[PDB]
Amino acid sequence: AMSMAVESTGNAKAEAESRAEAARIEGEGSVLQAKLKAQALAIETEAELE
């Protein structure tokens, strides 16, 4: 029974942590994607302002 416990832990644990630690990547993607679009859109808008 504590065997089947360890397989269940490993399976659900592995799947969930894979999803969350990938969401870390989409998160840092959001971080520096916001940072880049900040100045990018900034220069389009300040070029269309004049």
In the complex, the smallest distance separating the C-beta of residue 6 from a copy of itself, rounded to whole angstroms, is 6
Considering only residues 3 to 32 of the shown chain, the ones binding a copy of itself according to CB under 8 A are 4-32
CA distance 12 to 47: 51
| Structural tokens at position 22 | 């990938």
In the complex, the smallest distance separating the C-beta of residue 49 from a copy of itself, rounded to whole angstroms, is 10
Q: Taking the CA atoms of 13, 32, 38 and 47 in sequence, report the sign of the dihedral they define.
A: negative
In the complex, the smallest distance separating the C-beta of residue 24 from a copy of itself, rounded to whole angstroms, is 7
Sites of contact with a copy of itself (CB under 8 A): 1-2, 4-44, 46-48, 50
